Amino acid sequence: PTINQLVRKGREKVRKKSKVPALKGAPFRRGVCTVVRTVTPKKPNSALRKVAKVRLTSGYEVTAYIPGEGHNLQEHSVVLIRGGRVKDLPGVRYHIVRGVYDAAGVKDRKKSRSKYGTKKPKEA
Amino acid sequence: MLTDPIADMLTRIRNATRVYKESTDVPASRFKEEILRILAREGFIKGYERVDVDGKPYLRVYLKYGPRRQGPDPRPEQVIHHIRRISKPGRRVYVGVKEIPRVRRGLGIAILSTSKGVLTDREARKLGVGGELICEVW
Amino acid sequence: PKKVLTGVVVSDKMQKTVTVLVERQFPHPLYGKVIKRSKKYLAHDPEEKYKLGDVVEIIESRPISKRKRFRVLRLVESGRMDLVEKYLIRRQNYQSLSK
Amino acid sequence: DFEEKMILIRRTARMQAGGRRFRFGALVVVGDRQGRVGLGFGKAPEVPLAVQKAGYYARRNMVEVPLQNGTIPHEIEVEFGASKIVLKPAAPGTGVIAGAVPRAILELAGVTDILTKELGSRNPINIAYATMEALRQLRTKADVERLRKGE
Amino acid sequence: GRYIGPVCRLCRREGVKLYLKGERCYSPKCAMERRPYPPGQHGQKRARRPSDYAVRLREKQKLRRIYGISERQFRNLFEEASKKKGVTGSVFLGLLESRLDNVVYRLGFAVSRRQARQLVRHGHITVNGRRVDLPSYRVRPGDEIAVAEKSRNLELIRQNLEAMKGRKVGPWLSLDVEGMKGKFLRLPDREDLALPVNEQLVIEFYSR
RNA sequence: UAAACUCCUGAACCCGGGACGAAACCCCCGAGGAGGGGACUGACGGUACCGGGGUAAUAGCGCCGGCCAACUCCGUGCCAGCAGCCGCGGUAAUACGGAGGGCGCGAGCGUUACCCGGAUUCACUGGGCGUAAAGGGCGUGUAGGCGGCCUGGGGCGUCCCAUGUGA
RNA sequence: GGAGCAAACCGGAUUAGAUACCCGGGUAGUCCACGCCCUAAACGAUGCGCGCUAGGUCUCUGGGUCUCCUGGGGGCCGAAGCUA
Ligand SMILES: [Mg+2]
Ligand SMILES: [Mg+2]
Ligand SMILES: [Mg+2]
Ligand SMILES: [Mg+2]
Ligand SMILES: [Mg+2]
Ligand SMILES: [Mg+2]
Ligand SMILES: [Mg+2]
Ligand SMILES: [Mg+2]
Ligand SMILES: [Mg+2]
Ligand SMILES: [Mg+2]
Ligand SMILES: [Mg+2]
Ligand SMILES: [Mg+2]
Ligand SMILES: [Mg+2]
Ligand SMILES: [Mg+2]
Ligand SMILES: [Mg+2]
Ligand SMILES: [Mg+2]
Ligand SMILES: [Mg+2]
Ligand SMILES: [Mg+2]
Ligand SMILES: [Mg+2]
Ligand SMILES: [Mg+2]
Ligand SMILES: [Mg+2]
Ligand SMILES: [Mg+2]
Ligand SMILES: [Mg+2]
Ligand SMILES: [Mg+2]
Ligand SMILES: [Mg+2]
Ligand SMILES: [Mg+2]
Ligand SMILES: [Mg+2]
Ligand SMILES: [Mg+2]
Ligand SMILES: [Mg+2]
Ligand SMILES: [Mg+2]
Ligand SMILES: [Mg+2]
Ligand SMILES: [Mg+2]
Ligand SMILES: [Zn+2]
């Protein structure tokens, strides 16, 4: 592009979509469970994953994945979505924060607790 | 009609030097003289004279080159490695003083017109002025 | 100092008012190449002296009307319609753009 | 008896009935650490040999580096067709700020204050060659007026 | 503050003899004289060529660990180094030295820097009359890094004093061993220094 | 050397003393002025700080397949789960979970969100278009952009100097 | 307007099937006048203009006493240089 061109038209300011519509700028959003259930993984994997649809404060409604071995999520559990995609499964753009609300952490986990809401045990 | 006389010559020079031609012409101008008058001053050209071609004014620029070379490819070094116009006709460049380039850390020269002449990076600098950055060579 | 401008008069159809067009020039903030833009000013002319095609000095002035805050200072050269030629041509290619 | 360190060591492979057979490639830089340097590329059906093969073309190939208190006489952009790379001189107390590859080439070259970045393809190999032939063009204030003079 | 945990242990990862210990590190045992290899189940097996990372990395961890100092603090100094004129690699180090708890070591009023910190922090030291206890305190040139009144005749003070007789120390310094006090001549030249560390490699890692 | 053990230091804690922040308006000389002198007033606070006594006296989080610093043992067997991407787990897993060990950093360590960077991936600086994405199917022309050689007038851009301004 | 050809269509054959390939037949269409459509591998997949930078070879076309110089097109091979 000649400069005269640049002066006329100009360089199109790039722009990017938000891989997660949680809220205007919210870091997480409080949701509530509707369905809760195992769903088979994608192309190269297979292993009945844990997810739940989540009626939102934001009037929305979406699936969020549940991390860790086993969960206490029932068809009404208030919940907290942290939001992070999952190559494994379609549509799941959000992760659920174990450790807050009816998101009970995992039991018996020693490693990388924080990431799974579990308090640090004791030895005595 | 040629859009820019100037970079046209510099091209002449460039293409020429690349096959090592002793000297090559270029239509005459008060300005190109002045340009060359610096190509000489600073030792990029051996020099130039208002040679004629068919009643038409030109300039013989007599090209400086390196010594022959040893090993694969007897390619002479190059007196003019790199020449390129800056302030183009499509986009005028007009540097103030504290804005003049420092071509290749001194080794490089930068010509440029000025209200007090056709100076250079240091000549205009030391003289203490600014003007249209004609081009840089090294 | 009351800013002042030379632009060509470009319409006289007003009562004691005149349209003056003034190209400024300047360098593009990122692309340098001096570019050219222009604006019309609504000058006052209580003597209705200046006619079309006049090139005029215009001075920032006390507000005469909604759009007049300049007055005609002095002529600079009569016959120069060739410029109004342009302003008219421009203003006519428009009519062939709509739908 | 120069200092010696290999850049990258890769395992390409060719095809043929029955199966595929492989080879390995070793880029190596080599230098004194005061102006002598040389990278060289060698390939052999096995690693050690292949590295050794470099060690040969390494020392074999070479180039004068016109240093300057550990920096350089002036910046250079040089495009090896596909890859580009820009070296710029810097005050002492800066560092060898450059990539994996162009780093070694400069460090085992006695350099210590250099501003450099790649552009275009960042291909090790291709950037390698670019970095050499870059160096092989630096003119010293001397080298310069030794040409501009011609007396 | 300083990783209170096992320290005759770092000498082992860096692989260089480091004087975090006082007497003992000079003895046969910086941890290292008996065990010259890195800690852990492995480390006694054949290591591997540190990527250009590990190198610039481990060199940093060296020169840092040597002062037993806050990463945030270090990091800061490194940057302060670029803030001012001169050769950053040097002033960084020169600046490291200005640290009071480092002077009560270069001036030897203690066998270790960690030891040195205690005393400094405990008000045991002073400067020009005031009981500075801020390990951080940047020593400018020319100031009585003395010892305090309540402190002079102290048990572990003397054992380092009676051991501090003779033995020249620091061209950028001076020690009135009798009056129990030193001076900051000037800012430690690079040559005046001698650490197991390449400053040029630490700058590298602080560009990532 | 980590612990144990010996020694030395002495956060916390207790005792004592304890402000700077406040010299003015207000009072006499002179003149209610200039000039000097004369007194009151501290919420914070019996805190700051200063001296005496004085107890060894909180560690945590992330990671350790590659990028990326930091390895092995067991369990699990495409299940349980991991994930930023490349991918990992279908009996021998440094990629899952537990362990020992190691790396990083420490009153913090991680996660998520958004902004700039990397991105020379909108490119003025600094990009392209024969086949990778990209030459309008071809003309003709409006506006616009760009424009050869020499002399001279103005000096609009441009340049330089001073000056106001840029709190 | 309508000879030949020929989507669609009909029939024969081939095939598991054959709404195709092959064969027999066949209509718009192909042609003209006027009007519209405005697409394409509308390809050199290369915007136009201008100045620069070896030569070798045959070819179309023009000028000049003319085993060859000079100008304009069309090709192949290749200086330097560019190029993934
Ligand atoms: Mg600095
Ligand atoms: Mg300097
Ligand atoms: Mg101990
Ligand atoms: Mg202990
Ligand atoms: Mg005891
Ligand atoms: Mg005390
Ligand atoms: Mg009292
Ligand atoms: Mg009174
Ligand atoms: Mg009290
Ligand atoms: Mg009291
Ligand atoms: Mg307080
Ligand atoms: Mg006390
Ligand atoms: Mg590693
Ligand atoms: Mg299981
Ligand atoms: Mg296993
Ligand atoms: Mg494996
Ligand atoms: Mg494991
Ligand atoms: Mg991992
Ligand atoms: Mg950017
Ligand atoms: Mg950008
Ligand atoms: Mg561009
Ligand atoms: Mg591109
Ligand atoms: Mg085309
Ligand atoms: Mg003039
Ligand atoms: Mg004049
Ligand atoms: Mg300011
Ligand atoms: Mg039809
Ligand atoms: Mg074609
Ligand atoms: Mg060809
Ligand atoms: Mg070639
Ligand atoms: Mg070739
Ligand atoms: Mg090109
Ligand atoms: Zn030790």
PDB file of C-alpha atoms in Angstrom, chain B residues 42-44 64 77 79 104-105 107, chain D residues 73-76 89 139 144 147-148:
ATOM      1  CA  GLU B  42      33.387  12.007   1.038  1.00  0.00           C
ATOM      2  CA  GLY B  43      34.978   9.543  -1.378  1.00  0.00           C
ATOM      3  CA  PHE B  44      32.175   7.422  -2.791  1.00  0.00           C
ATOM      4  CA  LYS B  64      35.099   3.886  -6.948  1.00  0.00           C
ATOM      5  CA  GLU B  77      34.856  -5.036  -2.200  1.00  0.00           C
ATOM      6  CA  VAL B  79      33.092   1.504  -2.238  1.00  0.00           C
ATOM      7  CA  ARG B 104      25.795   3.104  10.657  1.00  0.00           C
ATOM      8  CA  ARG B 105      27.543   4.726  13.608  1.00  0.00           C
ATOM      9  CA  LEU B 107      30.877   5.340   8.941  1.00  0.00           C
TER      10      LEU B 107
ATOM     11  CA  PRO D  73      31.633  -1.357  14.755  1.00  0.00           C
ATOM     12  CA  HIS D  74      28.013  -0.740  13.688  1.00  0.00           C
ATOM     13  CA  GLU D  75      24.666  -2.457  13.272  1.00  0.00           C
ATOM     14  CA  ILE D  76      23.712  -4.757  10.445  1.00  0.00           C
ATOM     15  CA  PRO D  89      26.273  -2.288  19.019  1.00  0.00           C
ATOM     16  CA  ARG D 139      33.674  -2.769   8.356  1.00  0.00           C
ATOM     17  CA  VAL D 144      36.349   1.808   5.629  1.00  0.00           C
ATOM     18  CA  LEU D 147      38.540   1.764   0.661  1.00  0.00           C
ATOM     19  CA  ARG D 148      37.195   5.304   0.664  1.00  0.00           C
TER      20      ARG D 148
END
